[PDB]
Structure 1
Amino acid sequence: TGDERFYAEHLMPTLQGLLDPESAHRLAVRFTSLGLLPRARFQDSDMLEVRVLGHKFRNPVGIAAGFDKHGEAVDGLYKMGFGFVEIGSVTPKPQEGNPRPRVFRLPEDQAVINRYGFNSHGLSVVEHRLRARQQKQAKLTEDGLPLGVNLGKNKTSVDAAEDYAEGVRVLGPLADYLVVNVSSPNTAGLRSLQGKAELRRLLTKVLQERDGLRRVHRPAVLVKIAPDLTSQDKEDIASVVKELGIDGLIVTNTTVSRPAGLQGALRSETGGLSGKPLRDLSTQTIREMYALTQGRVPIIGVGGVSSGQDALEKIRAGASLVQLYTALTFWGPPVVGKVKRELEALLKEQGFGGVTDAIGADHRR
């Protein structure tokens, strides 16, 4: 907590004052991958353990996709205290993404707007990087620290479904779960894959490919959705998920909306908005998807989590696990232990024996 205060009040604001956010991002990935951070002090208690998606998670707090896009910092992220790590999005071929600048801080809103556009080292590079530590990961996974891989589509792809199928074939065998990212606001036409008929065709193909993998190399498949869906869109997704036996949902990606009240000078930049202004939009989307799937489909809740209260609100709304990203950029590494310690305190205060007991609790009130 002295550490928490030092990072939040001194170190992070200073780094943000010195570097543009993309440079700071690159440096953070480098520092994390070199293990230069001291190992997090918080010791995960048994009440934080969750069993879902065919795996044990030592704690329910993960790092969201987009921080480690290319799988370079996975071990340093576990060292920070994350219960699970998701890398990506990874596209089949390497691609540069959008021209710079393409990421913007909104400090007054504790938010970020990004339009990276799936900058990716590509499947082949990431495959080799993961293969180099594959057995180390197998041990981590067995110890309750799973790895997720988030798949995207190349900008010039003439067949979206084949892009995702290729990712299943190449990175599926290296992942505990795969995410079909059909919700980036930064690749033209992508979010239209959330529509009923596309989504059914796409996910049938993804699931066929996944089912074709050898048993020990067969990941769970999750779909990551936008916070900007119509009620019709959400009903349709819920129906397809149940029809096909999709293993879970990630709720939500960034928003293309700009909520009333944003103060940052850069609020009108094109891109997806993340952080505090997204928080309750995400929570409400979790609540809706949990109800539509009858609580039978595991949800990873993401968007604006920066405290134990934020985490518990998403868990009570229906999330089995949560992720954060934007909070790390403002508060630094100590935010992980902060969220975990506050979550444990609140679980006890509200009479929950553990995280598992709190999942979807608001729906039973």
Structure 2
Amino acid sequence: GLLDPESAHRLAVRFTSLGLLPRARFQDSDMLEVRVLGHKFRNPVGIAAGFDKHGEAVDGLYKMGFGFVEIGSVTPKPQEGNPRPRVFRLPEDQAVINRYGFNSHGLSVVEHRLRARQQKQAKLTEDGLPLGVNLGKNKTSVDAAEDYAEGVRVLGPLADYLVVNVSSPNTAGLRSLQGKAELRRLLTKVLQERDGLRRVHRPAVLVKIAPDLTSQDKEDIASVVKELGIDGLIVTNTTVSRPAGLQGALRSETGGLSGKPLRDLSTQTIREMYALTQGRVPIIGVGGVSSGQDALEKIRAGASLVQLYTALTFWGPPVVGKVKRELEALLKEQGFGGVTDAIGADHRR
């Protein structure tokens, strides 16, 4: 916290990549295993997109004890992102605001990085540690569908799941892709491209949505997802809202807000999306998770898996084991046999 947040992030990625931090001691219980999206997940706690944008620290992140890793967002061509400053800590709120704008090494660079460890990843996936790849679009793209299609073609063969990220608040016009007609067109093309890949290279496709959607938006997304047979949802990205009560000096910076102020907004979005999809569409729940309780609330709301990022920036690597240990204890306390039993449990009350 003695460096600016962006410099701190860069060093964190570097240290993680090099495997400098200690191997996680917490051994995952059978209670934490989830089978979803055609894969086994040794535990349901993943690293959210944005920490490892360019796929530089995948192995280090598994070493940290994450049950799955999502890299990205990756754009077709390299791009620098928005001018600095573009990331801000709100310590009083346990929150971050960012406006990176999809800084990305681009598909080619990431493709080569993942190819260098493709067989290692195949073994990790087999051993219950899958890899997700989150796709974005270039700033000056005229056809968003073509950007996402290129992402499917290039990184789809290297991923257990792909994420169509239409919910960054930091790319002009992007979140209009969540609209029914735009989303149907975009996802039809994405699924067509995915279906064209050889079977062993054919990933699940998820859509990552905003926490800022209207009821109509959410109904429309649920409809499209079901119509097209989309494999899952990631719920949610950062919020452009600024909840009453934020204390951080930097609360009025432009960008997506993450961390504790997003937590319950995200949980409620999960709850709504689960109900709108009749519990038949896997949800990865993300936003403000820093404890076992936070994880379980999202799971009971309908998430099959959870992710965190912002908590890691406050609590450091120990937060991963802490979430897992606390989640295990709570499942036992509440009479669940395991994570699987708790998924969507609130809806069966």
Name the TM-score class by shorter chain: over 0.9
Alpha-carbon deviation of 1:38? 0.7
**Percent identity of equivalent pairs:** 100
Alignment of 1:17-28 (within 5 A): 17-28=1-12
Q: For residue 237 of structure 2, give the secondary structure of its aligned residue in structure 1.
A: coil
Alpha-carbon deviation of 1:232? 0.1
Q: For residue 172 of structure 2, give the secondary structure of its aligned residue in structure 1.
A: coil
Q: For residue 152 of structure 2, give the secondary structure of its aligned residue in structure 1.
A: helix
What is the distance in 2 between the residues matched to 1:201 and 1:102? 32
Q: For residue 18 of structure 1, give the secondary structure of its aligned residue in structure 2.
A: coil
What is the distance in 2 between the residues matched to 1:98 and 1:291? 37
What is the distance in 2 between the residues matched to 1:339 and 1:38? 17
Residue 94 (structure 2) pairs with residue 110 (structure 1): yes
Cross-structure match for 2:284 = 300
Q: For residue 166 of structure 1, give the secondary structure of its aligned residue in structure 2.
A: helix
What is the distance in 2 between the residues matched to 1:284 and 1:244? 24
Cross-structure match for 2:37 = 53
Q: For residue 208 of structure 2, give the secondary structure of its aligned residue in structure 1.
A: strand
Residue 260 (structure 2) pairs with residue 289 (structure 1): no
Q: For residue 38 of structure 1, give the secondary structure of its aligned residue in structure 2.
A: coil
What is the distance in 2 between the residues matched to 1:37 and 1:134? 23
Residues 164-217 of structure 1: per-residue CA shift (max 9 Å, x gap): 000000000000000000000000000000000000000000000000000000
What is the distance in 2 between the residues matched to 1:50 and 1:158? 39
Alpha-carbon deviation of 1:241? 0.2
Residues 213-247 of structure 1: per-residue CA shift (max 9 Å, x gap): 00000000000000000000000000000000000
List structure 1 runs of 4+ shifted beyond 2 angstroms: none
Alpha-carbon deviation of 1:77? 0.1
Residues 133-168 of structure 1: per-residue CA shift (max 9 Å, x gap): 000000000000000000000000010000000000
What is the distance in 1 between the residues matched to 2:205 and 2:22? 33
Residues 276-295 of structure 1: per-residue CA shift (max 9 Å, x gap): 00000000000000000000
What is the distance in 1 between the residues matched to 2:20 and 2:91? 26
Alpha-carbon deviation of 1:18? 1.2
Alignment of 1:231-270 (within 5 A): 231-270=215-254
What is the distance in 1 between the residues matched to 2:139 and 2:49? 18
Alignment of 1:152-301 (within 5 A): 152-301=136-285
Alpha-carbon deviation of 1:31? 0.1
Residue 23 (structure 2) pairs with residue 39 (structure 1): yes
Residue 73 (structure 2) pairs with residue 89 (structure 1): yes
Residues 280-311 of structure 1: per-residue CA shift (max 9 Å, x gap): 00000000000000000000000000000000
Q: How large is the RMSD of aligned CA atoms in angstroms?
A: 0.3
Cross-structure match for 1:144 = 128
What is the distance in 1 between the residues matched to 2:243 and 2:208? 21
Query: Structure 1: 5+ residue runs without aligned partners?
Result: 1-16
What is the distance in 2 between the residues matched to 1:327 and 1:104? 14
Query: Structure 2: 5+ residue runs without aligned partners?
Result: none
Alpha-carbon deviation of 1:265? 0.2
Alpha-carbon deviation of 1:25? 0.2
What is the distance in 1 between the residues matched to 2:107 and 2:259? 28
Query: How many residue pairs align between the two structures?
Result: 349
What is the distance in 2 between the residues matched to 1:312 and 1:339? 9
What is the distance in 2 between the residues matched to 1:222 and 1:255? 19
What is the distance in 2 between the residues matched to 1:161 and 1:180? 10
Q: For residue 188 of structure 1, give the secondary structure of its aligned residue in structure 2.
A: coil
Q: For residue 257 of structure 2, give the secondary structure of its aligned residue in structure 1.
A: strand
Alpha-carbon deviation of 1:332? 0.1
Q: For residue 222 of structure 1, give the secondary structure of its aligned residue in structure 2.
A: strand
So what's the TM-score if we normalise by structure 2? 1.00
